[PDB]
Structures are given as C-alpha cells and as structure tokens.
Design an enzyme around this catalytic site. Structure first.
Site: not given
Ligand SMILES: O[C@H]1[C@H](O)[C@@H](O)CN2CC[C@H](O)[C@H]12
Length: 440
Positions: A75, A119, A289, A291
């Site tokens: 990706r 992005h 996503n 975390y």
């Molecule tokens: O680097 C970032 C990324 O560009 C985003 O899509 C969100 N993220 C979640 C964890 C970290 O912050 C990562």
C-alpha cells in the site's frame, strides 16, 4: 497454529510525503505538507519531508526489500502535486513516470499494488483556493482521480480514495496540528462533508474508467471503553465521531451518525442532506486502521476526556489493547456489513536501536503485531470478510508533526546514510507471510 484464508493479502504500507523526499523534484508543485513543515513551530525539531527516506531515489531497493521479505501487497500513496502541480489542469509526465516505474516493478515481482489516492499532501495551489473547505474540491479531486485511473488503472486494480478523512478534517482544520494547520470548527466540518463528496465523485469516475478494479476508503479507529457504568454514551459518541461511522453512516445510510449530529449539526452546511444521495455511491471495500484503545469518561468541561490507564504503551504513549482490533472488525460487520474489509494499517512506534550485533531487536514490536494478527484471525473465524492486513510501516519515516522522532518501520532507516536494516519484526513478519499465519 492460526492459518489465514487462501490468498489472504499480507502487506506493508507507506505514504508519499513520509518516505519520498525530493518534494519539488521533476516539476512537482508544493504540497501543504511542504509549506506546513517549512513553517517554524509546526513540526518537532524543525523536521521536514525534504529528504525523508529518499525513496524518490531508492524506490527500487525498497521494493527489493518487500520482495525479499515475501510480502504480497504494498500500500503506497501518490503525491497529488507531483501529478498535477497546480492541483488541476496541467499533468506532469515525470510524476506519472515515477509511479509507473514503481507499479511495473511491483507487478514484475508479483506484489499487489494498493494505491492511496490521497494521503494528506494536498497541492498547495488548491489550499490557496480553500482546499477541503471549498465545495469545488469534489470536482478537483474527481479530475485528479480520473488522471490516475486513466494512466494506472490498466495495472492497478485496488484503489483507496482517502486515508483517514477524520484526521484530515479534524486534526488539520480544528486542532491545527496537521496541515493546513487551521483551528475553525465550521471549516473542519465542511472539510468532513467535502471529503465525503470528493470520495463519492472519485468512486463515480472510477466506475466510468476502470471497469475491472475495486475501490474503497480508509478510516482511523480507536477502541473506546467506558471508565465505568453510568460514560457509555461518551464511548458511543467517540465511536460515532472518531471511528468509521462518521463516514460510513453517510455512505451506507445517507446521513451522519446521531450523536455526531447532536454535537456538530450547526457546523455542517445548512443543506448538507442535499448531497447525501451522491455520497451513497457504492464502494467495494472498507479499510480500517487500528492502533490503540482509550478509556473514556464524560467530562462536562466535546464532553469527553481520556483517562490514562496503567497499560503497556508505545513510544507514542498509546495504550496497547489488541482486543480492539477484533472489536472494530466485529463492529463494522455488525453496523454496515461491508462486502470486504482490510486492515490497512496496524503497527507501533518503539525506541529502536541498532545493537552491537548490527540488528534491531524489536521484540516489543513483534509482540504487538503478533497479538493484533491473532485478534484479526479471530474475527475471520467469526465471519468478518477480512481480505488482507497491512503493517504500518515498511520503513521508519517522517511521522508528521512528530518528525523523524517516531519509528514505525519493520525496517530501520539510518537517516545519516539512508542505510536500511531489516528489524527482527520484519524478519518475523516475513515468516508469518510465508506460513500464511501465526506459529509456524
Ligand atoms: O504515519 C501515520 C500515517 O500516515 C497515517 O495513515 C496514520 N497513522 C497511524 C499511526 C501513524 O501515525 C500513521
């Protein structure tokens, strides 16, 4: 053993501004992250994406790493201002050439490209015209997406319109912590709404241009738990606002979630429902996503504060709560039943060091990934149509407002030399991919 379905797509993820460097090379226009990071005070240590991991030059090497690890999907995102330097109008062939080489290389090597169209590196030229605050961005984004589809859609068959539109809107335009660095709640909610309109217009163009591929959208998600009974409504609000429902309630049901409307109705356009029929444009998959988890309690002084827990945390200070990934996967099936789901990011930042033996012994990151992969496996056993899982990130990189201080890679980057050192977590992940799952 925990074996995944046949053909399950194990991947790694990056984004253009975080890894490429050379932001103004070969006719590229400035992005809002270039101008934001070059503004003093915005980014830790004055760090910028000027060099990053030099992927603009080292792309072949980095893909060779993906190949050597046996990772099946990559990706990555495309820099809008490399392709259309003024955001609309002129197309930059050298920008297309850069991504064409990456695409052809991945395909040659049997790696599936997953392309994130946006992005966060909006062309600065469009920010001057209000960026995500301007309704006309649905047109600008449609025109950009059309260029990508026409140039790359013969080869790339898996597309993502937006990465984390909640962050783009709220962190960029309410918190002011990300580009374009604004603090206005009316602007932030118009950005939410315009992100949806732009996403939907791009999906519409996709159906006209790439009759053989799939397109979706990626959301950040937290696992919010209540600090007690009563609080559970605070959790309901955070889920609806911070997680996939903010966008999927419009896409699937044609309106914002109830508690989002309770908080934010006055900040949305007066006639925002007029756009909802178009927003419901059919999507092929949902990217999630995940975390971290948060303990949440009502707080009268969005009526929500976080409660710190004594749990293991990463270098971001984020609590490690692997059951959260199982929860969000279950919850998305239950709420919207998307036909396919991907975990489009999961990962962790730790204080990585290269030991005297030349290796990076990130057992903390192995433990983190193993636990989350295990919870994802569980969701599959219970019927969630999870088709793939992407580790954030292939490489340590520019972590936005934290700069280079936070390392998320399964590959360590020594920024003084640009040397890549595969971490123990990368070796460990390669074995997971080879075995198609956990415990050999
Ligand atoms: O680097 C970032 C990324 O560009 C985003 O899509 C969100 N993220 C979640 C964890 C970290 O912050 C990562």
């Amino acid at each position: 053993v925990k074996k995944f379905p046949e053909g399950f797509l194990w991947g790694v993820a990056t984004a253009s501004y975080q890894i490429e460097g050379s932001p103004l090379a070969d006719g590229a226009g400035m992005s809002i992250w270039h101008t934001f990071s070059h503004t003093p005070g915005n980014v830790k240590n004055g760090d910028t994406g000027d060099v990053a991991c030099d992927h603009y030059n080292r792309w072949k090497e980095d893909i060779e790493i993906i190949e050597k690890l046996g990772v099946k999907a990559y990706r990555f995102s495309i820099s809008w201002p490399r392709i259309l330097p003024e955001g609309t109008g002129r197309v930059n062939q050298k920008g297309l050439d850069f991504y064409n080489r990456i695409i052809d290389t991945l395909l040659e090597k049997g790696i599936t490209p997953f392309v994130t169209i946006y992005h966060w590196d909006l062309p600065f030229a469009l920010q001057l015209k209000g960026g995500w605050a301007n309704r006309e961005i649905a047109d600008w984004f449609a025109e950009y997406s059309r260029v990508l589809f026409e140039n790359f859609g013969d080869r790339v068959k898996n597309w993502i319109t937006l990465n984390e539109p909640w962050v783009v809107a709220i962190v960029g335009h309410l918190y002011g912590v990300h580009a374009p660095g604004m603090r206005d709640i009316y602007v932030a909610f118009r950005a939410v709404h315009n992100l949806l309109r732009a996403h939907a217009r791009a999906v519409k163009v996709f159906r006209e241009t790439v009759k053989d591929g799939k397109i979706g959208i990626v959301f950040n998600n937290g696992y919010f738990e209540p600090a007690s009974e009563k609080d559970i409504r605070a959790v309901r609000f955070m889920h609806q606002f911070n997680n996939y429902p903010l966008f999927l309630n419009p896409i699937y049901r044609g309106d914002y979630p109830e508690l989002v409307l309770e908080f934010a109705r006055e900040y949305l356009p007066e006639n925002y429902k007029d756009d909802m029929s178009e927003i419901q444009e059919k999507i092929d998959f949902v990217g999630l996503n995940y975390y971290s988890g948060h303990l949440v309690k009502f707080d009268p002084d969005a009526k929500v504060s976080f409660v710190e827990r004594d749990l293991p945390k990463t270098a971001m200070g984020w609590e490690i709560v692997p059951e959260g990934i199982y929860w969000i996967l279950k919850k998305v099936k239950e709420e919207y039943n998307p036909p396919e789901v991907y975990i489009t990011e999961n990962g962790a930042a730790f204080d990585d060091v290269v030991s005297e033996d030349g290796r990076v012994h990130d057992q903390n990151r192995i433990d983190y990934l193993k636990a989350h992969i295990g919870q994802a496996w569980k969701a599959i056993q219970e019927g969630v149509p999870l088709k793939g899982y992407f580790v954030w990130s292939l490489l340590d990189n520019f972590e936005w407002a934290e700069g280079y201080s936070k390392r998320f890679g399964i590959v360590y980057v020594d920024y003084s030399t640009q040397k890549r050192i595969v971490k123990d977590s990368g070796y460990w992940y390669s074995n997971v991919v080879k075995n198609n799952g956990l415990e050999d």
